[PDB]
Design a protein around this ligand. Sequence first.
Ligand SMILES: Nc1ncnc2c1ncn2[C@@H]1O[C@H](CSCC[C@H](N)C(=O)O)[C@@H](O)[C@H]1O
Ligand SMILES: Nc1ncnc2c1ncn2[C@@H]1O[C@H](CSCC[C@H](N)C(=O)O)[C@@H](O)[C@H]1O
Ligand SMILES: Nc1ncnc2c1ncn2[C@@H]1O[C@H](CSCC[C@H](N)C(=O)O)[C@@H](O)[C@H]1O
Ligand SMILES: [Mg+2]
Ligand SMILES: [Mg+2]
Ligand SMILES: [Mg+2]
Lengths: 363, 387, 393, 354
Amino acid sequence: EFDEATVQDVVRLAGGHDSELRELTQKYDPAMISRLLVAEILSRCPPPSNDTPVLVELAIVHGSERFRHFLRVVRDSPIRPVGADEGFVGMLVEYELTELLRELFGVTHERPAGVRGTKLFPYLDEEAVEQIGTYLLAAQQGTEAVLAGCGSRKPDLSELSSRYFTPKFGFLHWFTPHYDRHFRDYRNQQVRVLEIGVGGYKHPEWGGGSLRMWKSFFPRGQIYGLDIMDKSHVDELRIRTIQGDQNDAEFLDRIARRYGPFDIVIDDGSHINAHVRTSFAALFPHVRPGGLYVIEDMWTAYWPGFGGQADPQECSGTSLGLLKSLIDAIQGYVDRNIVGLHVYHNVAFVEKGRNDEGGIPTW
Amino acid sequence: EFDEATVQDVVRLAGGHDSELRELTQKYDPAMISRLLVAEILSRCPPPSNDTPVLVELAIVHGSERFRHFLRVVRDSPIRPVGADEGFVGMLVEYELTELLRELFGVTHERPAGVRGTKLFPYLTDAVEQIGTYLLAAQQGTEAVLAGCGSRKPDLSELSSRYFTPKFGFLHWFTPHYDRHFRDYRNQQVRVLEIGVGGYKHPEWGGGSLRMWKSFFPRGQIYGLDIMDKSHVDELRIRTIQGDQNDAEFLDRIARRYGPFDIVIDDGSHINAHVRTSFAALFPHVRPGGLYVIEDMWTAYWPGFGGQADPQECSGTSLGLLKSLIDAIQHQELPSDPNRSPGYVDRNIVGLHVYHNVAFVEKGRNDEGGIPTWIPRDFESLVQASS
Amino acid sequence: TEFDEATVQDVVRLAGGHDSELRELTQKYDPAMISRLLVAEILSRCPPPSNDTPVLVELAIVHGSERFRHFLRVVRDSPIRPVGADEGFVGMLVEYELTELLRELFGVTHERPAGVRGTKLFPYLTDDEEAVEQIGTYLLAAQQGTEAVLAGCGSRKPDLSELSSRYFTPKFGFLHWFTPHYDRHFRDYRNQQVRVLEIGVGGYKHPEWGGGSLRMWKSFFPRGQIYGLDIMDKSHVDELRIRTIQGDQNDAEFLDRIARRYGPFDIVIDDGSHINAHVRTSFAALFPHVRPGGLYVIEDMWTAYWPGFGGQADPQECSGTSLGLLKSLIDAIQHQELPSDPNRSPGYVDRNIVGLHVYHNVAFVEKGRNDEGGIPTWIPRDFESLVQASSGG
Amino acid sequence: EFDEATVQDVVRLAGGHDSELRELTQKYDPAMISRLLVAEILSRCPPPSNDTPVLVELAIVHGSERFRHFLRVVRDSPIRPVGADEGFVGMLVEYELTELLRELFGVTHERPAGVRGTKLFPYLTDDEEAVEQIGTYLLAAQQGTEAVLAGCGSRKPDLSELSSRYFFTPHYDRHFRDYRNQQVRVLEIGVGGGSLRMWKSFFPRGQIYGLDIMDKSHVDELRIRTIQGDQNDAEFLDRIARRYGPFDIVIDDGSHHVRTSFAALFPHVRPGGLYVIEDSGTSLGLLKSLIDAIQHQELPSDPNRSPGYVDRNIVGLHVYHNVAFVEKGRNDEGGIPTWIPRDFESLVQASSGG
Ligand SMILES: Nc1ncnc2c1ncn2[C@@H]1O[C@H](CSCC[C@H](N)C(=O)O)[C@@H](O)[C@H]1O
Ligand SMILES: Nc1ncnc2c1ncn2[C@@H]1O[C@H](CSCC[C@H](N)C(=O)O)[C@@H](O)[C@H]1O
Ligand SMILES: Nc1ncnc2c1ncn2[C@@H]1O[C@H](CSCC[C@H](N)C(=O)O)[C@@H](O)[C@H]1O
Ligand SMILES: [Mg+2]
Ligand SMILES: [Mg+2]
Ligand SMILES: [Mg+2]
């Protein structure tokens, strides 16, 4: 329900100083921004762990206005807003709108206190005693889950991998600690991230796990997912899917001009060797200086059914032949703009930037 | 179970270089060390999220020996060892003994790969229906076990929920302050004393915060003091001690036995006199560069805890102590006096951090020197001297 | 001089954005003027050179078809300054895209070990008989000169203690040992477009001395604006990102005026008169103008023990001292734990302090919403009752 | 001057808790330890900036013992021990012996205060004659103390500054800095011994080894041992690696062989360590093959072929301009399972649910 350009503008202004936050809250309706922040919060919350269901009241305040959201918190259900009559309110959490903007989407130092207000058992007589023993722990656990969603603490990619049912870590692959190392320093930037391959293939429901992972990892980011199949059902706040073929260089240049430039591009697509090579040539020019191009699953370089060759020395048309040529380049556009190559099992990271430093007179 | 002196020695040696790791494995029976590491791993694992129970085989290798442990992993149950046949084995995880020691108890950089070997569905003969049933569960179960085989910093706020301790989420909001002050100690072989194990007179309750410090400090030894017997809490790297925090003689005995402490935390009776007695007796047993923490100063204002409703009538309160520490930090700035001489606390405090219901005191040599004589002692004279 | 304050701040704001903001910037402003602004910043940012032999480092700032060339004369004991192309031996050519230099100096960015610039050693050296002797003469000087210039072209965190000895301030080394505390408390703000107000510019009555600490904060906060308040005139200290203000720190109405004009502040430092009344007046007047999550800093609380600054020799008679203030802030932090009273109303400070850090001669006060809630009435208010209510039988 | 085995033991013990620090100081003469710590300090000190020559007295206390060292600190001159009457004492710095051990060689958090005592102008008496010196020795005593206290800790240095001081580096910093609190063993092949001093400075708890064909025993100092021999003799390389290793880091300068030293020395890099190749067509070929080594578990199964040592032991490769970093570790994650299809269309069908 939120305009993408608007969300991007809110995130841009949130990263600013007091004048930008003020500009933000005058440019847009506060009620609308509050709804946007709650939608963000609900996606950021970890899974609840309390057995007894509780409500956490989230009050967002701007000037004279008070926007109240009653959140149902119980294990095995995602946190959702419900009516005030639908359960026991264990906690009231109050935020100033601009403070919540800073905590969610700002460029901020860590703030261990003073970001909000809290009032325990806010509407609590007869049962006064009995109510404590039933909801005390559940309210502690419910509140912790909501407050976790109200900030920008760095999550654990390996855990997100299990949570969003993506195979980046835990069975087939062990990519996430490499992703963490290469990606974590970008987290306060308003990144644009493009992943080739949303997941689920031709099945009408599956896919998007890795997109949800990047959204969670990059609190200020916009995530784009390209897939040959329609993935419109995956789209949500800060996640856009695009339908098209990674093997169409012209089309890639087109979407890169509309949505770029990209801080990060990830290839987890078809895994056809020619596709990997086409996508790189087409998209590497659209990676920002200081940005990254990632290729997953180079294993197909050894398999003819993906356009590979079993003989590792026959690498001329494979993803590994590309990586090998990137080594030559480091020591054409690509040649002039690569400063680093990181290779791990089934994943490689390419660092973009002018390869122009340390020049000497050849004589 | 496992002898405390031995556990501490293992951790000491595991923090060294190759020669220390070799000394370790030659000094102790490899089989015993493996059981120790598995006990540690069991407490270290996060709660699993897989609905279908799986086994993760952990194989620990040393020389020609191979120690096999089968861990049952399922949501809502603690991870536990079982026999080989007591489930479907979704993953084989293999460690060299010395590598697992480094990963659990070592002083080590982050290692994103190469610390172990993995074999998915290790005993599956090619198997179809088994994929549908177990792939996701194997992935999630392995993820939980592997988290327990490393030293990744946990979230104290989350641990508070998990271990049922009031440090964060309802009554209190301490954990982010603890994180800031404590996280830089995590690669040290810390000794942590908390006064107040929890549960009071209840026969089973308590120890949540001790379990929390154990998780946070992968190389630490945790001690918990309580007036009530808390022997049921004791586990690897956690010892409870029965005694009275208001008994200075006893505190000194246990400090000599188990100290010196890098960290002391008072979360005890919250009687103002007790807080002051414990601080005076235990502050000398805090290491230089260490911390003394006082929780729940709220009782300063409450007579039923020895406090006073008037914040100015603070001479016997925990806040009165904290206020006096400010003067202690500044003590070298007092005008010259041949009669007066600085006390132990004066000479040994270099920082005070006060937050709502929690305060951190930095132990260290307070000997920077006061403002020299030649700097004028009135405003006007200072202005004319600096021009 | 040429660089309007609102312009500098706008440049810094846009530099912190993504590609669309960097493009917006270079379209909003003349690329040549921006390039001049960046060079002015770079000259202030460079460390002292160590090379004995003077070299030229050519900094070329490229934007589209335009190439803005600056020849920087670099030598030990002299401030790096622009000279003519022919006024030395060019040891190194350093080349930046305009938008890339903007990101590096004023942006919010991850560490980039490579790929931010191009360099060419001895760019104009002709293959001659003199060339061999010229390489012997200039090789070391070229690398040392380049190091000094490259350090000024980035936002790498400086050592605070080093900046103390460089700009001649007593924050560390002899009288005081403040810098490691300042580093601990200030380093997490370095990404932000901070506004920092320091009361007490330095130099006192002397018409030349002072500004040392202000230059220290400018260097430490790459994206910041620094304000210095002093009763005396300090107009000579003013430079890019540093403004001085003339006035009394003990005049509350004036403080509220300047805070409304230049605030709100992420950080306020009191290093002024050290008069006990002045510290108290300033805190009450300026604390409301510290941003939530910001810091109020008090230096030199040693004068609290001395009548000549309105202090008292007896530490117990602290009602009017800076130490008395710090003591009361502990109660302010704890105020929600007070027994309820209909007539008592929590004050502004009560509601807005969330932390206090006290070190020898320096204290840091954390501004934020103090509204965690006090211990509920239904928690027993005596130890024996607590034991009973917590033992479940 | 100081026995190598002893230095390593001191460093090992200093990295422990209280019981190790006490064991250290009861195992060795405190006077000797003090002299070792001073030697270390002098090598860690940055170049002084003060024009006026001043003395900094470093006093090291252990029980009844008090070891007093007067250090002349002047611009354009290295800091050295002198007598008390060889200048003006502008500052007395005092450390507990165990505290100095921790600060220099310990595994410790950053401690912004309370690690020492300091007394400015510790011997200046009277008032009328004192004013004269205060004006001339104030600025110098601040700059002189700064330089000494800088050498008294384990703060990370700037490799770029070190590279000029001892007559590219940002990549070294990236990959090396996480090792700094470990008692590392670093071997550099190809040795003036400027770069060995750089690594000594960068790794405060480290032992550095430099191999060269020339005799470079004049480069040897605390925590730096040079080794003479042939780097093309693979047996020799294996021999010295067993003797002095295993190595957390090996640095191989290929410009002045690389395949030979890599094959011989890679097995002696610790798991989780680094093999570094600086600079040339034979170097590049090796780097490219290391990609296949990383990916070796993805090869189609072959009974006649079995993975080599390198295949099983490389887990990462980082290539930059003129330098590459190879990560040693167990490469045993498992290849893609047989039951995953080996052509695109079959893969699409098998993971589309219907
Ligand atoms: N030629 C092509 N162009 C674009 N997408 C393609 C393609 N061929 C296959 N794909 C898509 O690439 C996806 C590979 S699976 C991606 C997995 C996902 N990144 C995750 O981690 O969960 C499939 O969904 C498939 O539909
Ligand atoms: N005089 C005394 N000496 C030691 N412990 C005491 C004491 N009086 C009370 N206690 C103990 O202090 C504890 C307070 S509750 C401690 C809670 C625990 N730290 C947690 O965070 O979960 C109770 O277990 C009580 O038995
Ligand atoms: N009432 C008042 N209001 C504002 N400034 C005052 C003042 N009384 C004194 N000052 C100024 O405060 C300064 C104290 S010295 C400041 C030192 C400087 N902050 C540094 O660290 O380098 C003097 O320059 C003096 O002119
Ligand atoms: Mg993949
Ligand atoms: Mg408590
Ligand atoms: Mg001062």
